[PDB]
RNA sequence: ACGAGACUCUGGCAUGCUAACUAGUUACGCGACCCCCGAGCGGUCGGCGUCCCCCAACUUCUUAGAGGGACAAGUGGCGUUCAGCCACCCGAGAUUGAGCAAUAACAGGUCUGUGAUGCCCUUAGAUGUCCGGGGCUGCACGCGCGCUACACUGACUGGCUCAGCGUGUGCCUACCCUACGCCGGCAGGCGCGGGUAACCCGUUGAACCCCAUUCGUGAUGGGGAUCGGGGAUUGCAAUUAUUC
């Protein structure tokens, strides 16, 4: 990944790591009381972003963009 | 004079240090093989020089190799160089030793102009 | 607005002007002082750091493109 | 003829040495993975080699 | 042993084998009803099986 | 507590340790330290005339992180973008002579040594001073 | 309570008109430390309304073609300029932002298909999404044309634009087109 | 013997690959050997893309041709003279097979 | 940085054969003369052992001619052989940097000597066409019309 | 019934399964480090080993097979209450992108892709074929597709930190990717290995970006056209400039 893509992966991982440790080695009534607060705020801390990228097609420079058509 | 050294030292000096007063391209070209085709042209040029009567311009020699560098050995020669249709006439004088025979025989007559026809809306 | 082109090591006549006026307002950036009296912008940051050495202007931002300064506390 | 200049020009490096392996053509070649086949013939034999239009 | 071919070219090399093999048997067994070929490859003793409609001729 | 180079801001750390070679002048500087043009993709040779010391500080820190690197690896690290002018810009590596000279420069100070594999890595004492400086800058940075 | 950038507590901002109480997204619920979150706020409709305002202006500022991947840069542009605001006025950057938005949000516009006289035929009131959508856009365009060839850069170039818009002085480029759009709609009522 | 022999295989189609390897794996179990399971490499995709038209006339359409190469290998600690027969009784004419000795 | 403008701050100079402006920085003021670029100005400045942060105007008399001796005889003043303009001159062969109207007439020497030899490059120079092998079908139109 | 859809590939989820010395992760035993007055299970290591058979296990990470999983399913609202649509909950995912693609048509392009071809032309002073040189670039002009810019949401110098596709030594065919050490300012050169490849290049130390300095609104430290000189590389040959 890149700088920010990494920067999101760290915070996403440590949030999952904490709750996973909380669920396993102590009462998860505490984990449920920590799972809620970081859900009502920035749901991305646990749910991973499912959109990666889109392939490029042979009609233009990018995925949806097309090479500029000239007919005059 | 050529590089602060006059033409007198140019004629008698050897190949292993004319590379340095040559530019990078001609130095590289002589650093590698000098084939049998251009040796014969120099051979035939020498025979033309000796066959020239005194104070007389040696006879025209024709060639296809419009890629030879000019050497001190054959300065003062009448060399005809093909451009694809005819042998252009070129005289050889001291100040080209770092050029080519093709650089002088131009391969196309320059365009003057023509009145636009059906195109050029 | 055509051209200013008039700034070479701001003189004593200007010198007294900014030294008694700049510390009396809050918005000090090398750009505004460049607009305010006439300053170009190179010696602007030289002037602000020279003032910053005196201890009468307080630096808040300290960034590359933006070095933001403010006047002292009053009272 | 004679043997001294018939092939004097080197069929070394370049388009002269390279050619298609089906039509002896020297245009639209594909040397990737050592095919040495032109693009028209490669499309023609693609299934036999095993290049499949998956997606 | 000394000079072995890269795997990507190797599967190409087998692929370019059957392509031309099928092509030549097509021009050779056209009137015989070629109807395709199968090359039963083994590391040493490769065998080729023709699928002619009239194998008798 | 500590202190390694990882827990100190590398931007301030590389400035601090470059001062160390400036203070303890033994790093042999080549003749051309004024005229290299420094990584061909670049022009307008570096502003700081001590650019060889900040380079030496920088390459020492880099090797401490990812050791077993040679001259070619150094040129890739410092390679920037070459602006081809009218042609679109590309990536080009740094000059090999400067990276070669600094690599031998640390040899004369016995911070780095050749290894069984290609490249050179910091010696026990070589990384020792690097951690001393890392502690020095941290304590200065901390207060 | 959220110490945005380590300061500027949320629970003091007030918004006047009932319409953008629903829309202004500076409330403590969506009180983020930074204006940066790839939260799919444009994948569906109606989500950009609840996207935080501080994210919106730093997301519109990232627009001239030459700066399209500069989000972290636009975060520093707002975070710096927010210092210039709080330095000059002493109150909340967040408050004056909202006052600038509601003041600079054009209400009446003109759109039709008949033979338009000057802009269009029929004057049409705006919805309170394009109103806040457009209002940010003048502010972003209001710093861009000023910071193009001036000595002063975007941090102050944005800064003076908001405070001029917030108080109302007819000298900000944003509110200068606002009333102009309003009066042309009143012209062709 | 006891020999640390490895057997590898590779092809383009996977359905035969799954069965033929497992055939060697099961042959190993009925031979009661210290057997290392099938270690499988990342697939290799060949990505030849072609103009799709014989002439120059078209609408700039292209042809994306693919070929997938999958390679797997098994490892054993059993004598060569007692493992040759099993690796020989499985043929699968669509597959490529290579052997190497314990010391490699 | 000073209380008043430096007393001998020269707003205009008369170095060589032009008037370089004094307000501009020294490294980019001396470069205004023909024959010196950004790198040549910077290296000769370092050999002069003068700081870069100052302007051209306050550069006092001693450094006025110290630079001039640097950049007319680079060879003996430890300027590298790779840096010169007229390296291996086509007539004299001395490694020298030409930096004046001399450069104006030296460059003028090439156009005639190629013209006097009727080289294809010289003829294209004479006719005003491109000399390095460019394409003139759809470019260079502004020079004729 | 064909086409659409369905279908195949691809992307996202499985701390579920099968496995990993050509991927590794933790734990350990070291070795250097550092604070040490002692701390100490302090932490740094892409430094070493942990399959020469335990000196430890395991698959979370990586890879790829089998699978499962999503279906307007649940909840409300609308709708003839139909087909469906809207919103919400739980969810990785509530529309991921492609490939294929009907009946046909067009004097569409292709005889310069083919030992695909009908007919015509030419066939020894060849329109066969080879060799040499030139040309396909040639410029009063017009059009199209693009790249670089018109800058201080910026150039310059220095430093910090990050990827994914995919390639790599040859039937012909000689032409591969390259680490490291040395010389050169660069261009490069010289030795020295590795790699037919999840082994080496390569932890692919990419750019933008990020953090400090200079510039100061000036056609300027923008912009890099044209233009002179010099040096290297490819080749048998570089001029009309191969490239750098
Ligand atoms: Mg593009
Ligand atoms: Mg379908
Ligand atoms: Mg030029």
Domain boundaries, chain E: 7-57
Q: Where are the domains of chain H?
A: 1-104
Question: Cβ(G172)–Cβ(G100) under 8 Å?
Answer: no
Beta carbons of A19 and A31 less than 8 angstroms apart: yes
CA angle G109, G112, G118 (to 5 degrees): 70
Q: What is the CATH number of the domain that holds D14?
A: 4.10.830.10
Minimal Cα–Cα distance from I128 to chain B, Å? Answer: 12
Indicate left, alpha or beta for H9 from its phi (over 0: left) and psi (-120 to 50: alpha): beta
Beta bridge partners of G108: G125
Strand (E) or helix (H) holding G78: helix G71-89
Torsions phi, psi for I21 (to 5 deg): -75, 140
Rounded to whole angstroms, the Cα distance separating F54 from B16 reads 45
Query: Which distant-in-sequence residues (6+ apart) come within 8 Å of D47 by Cβ?
Result: none
CA distance G153 to G155: 6
Resolution (A): 2.8
Distance between terminal CA atoms of chain H? 16
Cβ–Cβ contacts within 10 Å for residue B15, how many? 11
What the block records as the tokens of B68 is 């030879």
Sign of the torsion angle spanned by Cα atoms G111, G112, G115, G117: negative
How many Cα atoms occupy the beta-carbon half-sphere of F123 within 13 Å?
Answer: 11
Could you give the CA distance from residue G136 to residue G142 in angstroms, rounded to a whole number? Answer: 9
Task: Please tell me the distance from the alpha carbon of residue B22 to that of residue B25, in angstroms, as a whole number.
Answer: 8
* Exposure letters I57-86 (e unless 16+ CB within 10 A, then b): bbbeeebeeebbebbeebeeeebeeebbbb
The CA angle F67-F71-F76, to the nearest 5 degrees, is 85
**Three-class secondary structure of residue G94 per DSSP:** helix
C34's tokens: 């460049």
Structure determination technique employed? cryo-EM
d(CA G87, CA G80) in angstroms, rounded, equals 11
Q: Distance (Å) from the C-alpha of residue I49 to the closest C-alpha of chain B?
A: 34
Q: Mutation target for E interface from H9, H10, H93: give the one with most E CBs within 10 A.
A: H93
Q: Are H59 and H25 in contact (CB under 8 A)?
A: no
Return d(Cα E50, Cα D11) in angstroms, integer: 39
G60: how many CB neighbours lie within 10 A of its CB?
A: 15
Strand partners, H46: H67
Q: Collapse the DSSP code of B42 into the 3-class scheme (helix H, G, I; strand E, B; otherwise coil) and give the result.
A: helix
Residue closest to G57 by CA, chosen among G135, G3, G145: G135
Say how far apart CA C16 and CA C37 lie, in whole Å: 12
The SS3 of residue G36 is coil
Q: Going by CATH, does the domain composed of E7-57 fall within 2.60.40.420?
A: no
Q: Given CB atoms, is B100 within the 8 Å cutoff of chain I?
A: no
Nearest partner of B41 among B101, B97, B103, judged by Cα? B101
Domain count for chain C? 1
Order of strands across the sheet that contains B87-91: B61-63, B78-82, B87-91
| Per-residue tokens: F6 | 């990882």
Shortest CA distance from H10: residue in chain E: E7
CB-based touch B/I (3+ pairs, under 8 A): yes
d(CA I145, CA I142): 5
Q: Which residues contact I61 (CB under 8 A, 6 or more apart)?
A: none
Reference G20, options G132, G96, G103, G106; nearest CA is G132
Ligand 3 centroid from CA I139, angstroms: 17
Residue H64: beta bridge partners? Answer: H49
From F117, F5, F22, F141, select the one nearest F60 (Cα to Cα).
F5
Q: Per-domain residue ranges for chain F?
A: 1-143
Residue among E25, E14, E20 at smallest CA distance from E52: E25
What are the two backbone dihedrals, phi and then psi, of residue H75, each rounded to the nearest 5 degrees? -135, 145
Closest CA to A45 of G55, G37, G3: G37
> Topology of I12-77 in CATH?
Helicase, Ruva Protein; domain 3 (1.10.8)
Instruction: Give the whole-angstrom CA distance, residue B3 versus residue E37.
Output: 75
Asked if residue H11 lies in contact with residue E15, where contact means CB atoms within 8 angstroms, the answer is no
Residues across chain F: 143
Q: In angstroms, what is the C-alpha Rg of chain E?
A: 14
Q: What angle do CA F126, F129, F130 make, to 5 degrees?
A: 85
Distance F18 CA to J159 C1' (A): 12
Can you tell me the distance from the alpha carbon of G165 to that of I136, in angstroms, rounded to the nearest whole number? 55
Nearest to G57 by CA among G38, G36, G40: G36
Give how many domains chain D has, as a whole number. Answer: 1
Distances (CA, A) of A22 to A40, B57, I104: 19, 104, 80
F-I interface: how many C-beta pairs under 8 angstroms? Answer: 19
**C·G CB contacts under 8 A:** 39
Which long-range CB contacts under 8 A does G86-93 form with residues at least 24 apart?
G86/G7, G86/G8, G87/C26, G87/C27, G87/C60, G87/C68, G87/C70, G88/C26, G88/C27, G88/G159, G88/G163, G89/G163, G92/G8, G92/G12, G92/G13, G93/G8
How many helices and strands, by DSSP H and E, does chain D display?
A: 1, 2
Structural domain for D50, as ranges: 1-55
The length of chain C, given as a count of residues = 75
């Amino acid at each position: 990944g890149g700088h920010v893509a990494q920067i999101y992966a760290i915070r996403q991982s440590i949030s999952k790591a904490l709750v996973a440790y909380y669920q396993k080695y102590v009462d998860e009534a505490s984990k449920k009381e920590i799972k809620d607060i970081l859900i009502q705020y920035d749901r991305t801390l646990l749910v991973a972003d499912p959109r990666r990228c889109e392939s490029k097609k042979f009609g233009g420079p990018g995925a949806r963009a097309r090479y500029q058509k000239s007919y005059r | 004079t050529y590089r602060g050294v006059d033409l007198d030292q140019l004629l008698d000096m050897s190949y292993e240090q004319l590379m340095q007063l040559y530019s990078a391209r001609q130095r590289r070209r002589l650093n590698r093989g000098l084939r049998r085709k251009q040796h014969s042209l120099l051979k035939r040029l020498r025979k033309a020089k000796k066959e020239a009567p005194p104070m007389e311009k040696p006879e025209v020699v024709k060639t296809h190799l419009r890629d030879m560098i000019i050497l001190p050995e054959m300065v003062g020669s009448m060399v005809g160089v093909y451009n694809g249709k005819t042998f252009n006439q070129v005289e050889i004088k001291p100040e080209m030793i770092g050029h080519y025979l093709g650089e002088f025989s131009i391969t196309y007559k320059p365009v003057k102009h023509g009145r636009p026809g059906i195109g050029a809306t | 607005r055509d051209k200013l082109n008039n700034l070479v090591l701001f003189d004593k006549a200007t010198y007294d002007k900014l030294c008694k006026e700049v510390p009396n307002y809050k918005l000090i950036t090398p750009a505004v002082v460049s607009e305010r009296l006439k300053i170009r912008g190179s010696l602007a940051r030289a002037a602000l750091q020279e003032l910053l050495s005196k201890g009468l202007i307080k630096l808040v931002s300290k960034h590359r493109a933006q070095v933001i300064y403010t006047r002292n506390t009053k009272g | 003829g004679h043997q001294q200049l018939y092939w004097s020009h080197p069929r070394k490096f370049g388009q002269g040495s390279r050619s298609c392996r089906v039509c002896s053509n020297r245009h639209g070649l594909i040397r990737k993975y050592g095919l040495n086949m032109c693009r028209q013939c490669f499309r023609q034999y693609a299934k036999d080699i095993g290049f499949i239009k998956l997606d | 042993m000394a000079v072995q071919i890269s795997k990507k070219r190797k599967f190409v090399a087998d692929g370019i084998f059957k392509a031309e093999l099928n092509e030549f048997l097509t021009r050779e067994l056209a009137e015989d009803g070629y109807s395709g070929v199968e090359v039963r490859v083994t590391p040493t003793r490769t065998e080729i099986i023709i699928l002619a409609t009239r194998t008798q001729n | 507590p500590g202190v390694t180079v990882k827990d100190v801001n590398q931007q301030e750390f590389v400035r601090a340790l470059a001062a160390f070679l400036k203070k303890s002048g033994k790093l042999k500087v080549p003749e051309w330290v004024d005229t290299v043009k420094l990584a061909k993709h670049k022009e307008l040779a570096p502003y700081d005339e001590n650019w060889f010391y900040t380079r030496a500080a920088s390459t020492a820190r880099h090797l401490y992180l990812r050791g077993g690197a040679g001259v070619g690896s150094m040129t890739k690290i410092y390679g920037g973008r070459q602006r081809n002018g009218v042609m679109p810009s590309h990536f080009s590596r740094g000059s090999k002579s400067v990276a070669r000279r600094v690599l031998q420069a640390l040899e004369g100070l016995k911070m780095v040594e050749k290894d069984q594999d290609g490249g050179r890595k910091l010696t026990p004492q070589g990384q020792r001073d690097l951690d001393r400086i890392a502690g020095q800058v941290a304590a200065a940075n901390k207060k | 309570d959220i110490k945005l950038f380590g300061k500027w507590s949320t629970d003091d901002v007030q918004i006047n008109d009932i319409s953008l109480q629903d829309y202004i997204a500076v409330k403590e619920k969506y009180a983020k430390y930074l204006p940066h979150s790839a939260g799919r706020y444009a994948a569906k409709r109606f989500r950009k309304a609840q996207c935080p305002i501080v994210e919106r202006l730093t997301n519109s500022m990232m627009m001239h073609g030459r700066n399209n991947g500069k989000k972290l840069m636009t975060v520093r542009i707002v975070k710096h300029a927010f210092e210039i605001i709080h330095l000059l006025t002493g109150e909340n950057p967040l408050q004056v932002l909202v006052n600038a938005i509601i003041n600079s949000g054009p209400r009446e516009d003109s759109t039709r298909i008949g033979r338009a006289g000057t802009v269009r035929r029929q004057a049409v009131d705006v919805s309170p999404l394009r109103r806040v959508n457009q209002a940010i856009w003048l502010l972003c365009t209001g710093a861009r044309e000023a910071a193009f060839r001036n000595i002063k850069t975007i941090a102050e170039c944005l800064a003076d634009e908001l405070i001029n818009a917030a108080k109302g002085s007819s000298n900000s480029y944003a509110i200068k087109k606002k009333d102009e759009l309003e009066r042309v709609a009143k012209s062709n009522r | 013997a006891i020999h640390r022999i490895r057997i590898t295989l590779t092809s383009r189609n996977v359905k035969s690959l799954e069965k033929v390897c497992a055939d060697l794996i099961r042959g190993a179990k009925e031979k009661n050997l210290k057997v290392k399971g099938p270690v499988r490499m990342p697939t290799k995709t060949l990505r030849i893309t072609t103009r799709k038209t014989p002439c120059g006339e078209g609408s700039k359409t292209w042809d994306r041709f693919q070929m997938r190469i999958h390679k797997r290998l098994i490892d054993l600690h059993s004598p060569s003279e007692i493992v040759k027969q099993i690796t020989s009784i499985s043929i699968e004419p669509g597959v490529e097979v290579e052997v190497t000795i314990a010391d490699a | 940085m000073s209380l008043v403008i430096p007393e001998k701050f020269q707003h205009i100079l008369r170095v060589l054969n032009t008037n370089i402006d004094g307000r501009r920085k020294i490294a980019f003021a001396i470069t205004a003369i023909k024959g010196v670029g950004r790198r040549y100005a910077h290296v000769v400045l370092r050999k002069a052992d003068i700081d870069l942060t100052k302007r051209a105007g306050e550069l006092t008399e001693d450094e006025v001619e110290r630079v001039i001796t640097i950049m007319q005889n680079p060879r003996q003043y430890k300027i590298p052989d790779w840096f010169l303009n007229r390296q291996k001159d086509v007539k004299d062969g001395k490694y020298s940097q030409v930096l004046a109207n001399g450069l104006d007439n030296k460059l003028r020497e090439d156009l005639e000597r190629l013209k006097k030899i009727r080289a294809h490059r010289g003829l294209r120079h004479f006719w005003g066409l491109r000399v390095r092998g460019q394409h003139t079908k759809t470019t260079g139109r502004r020079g004729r019309t």
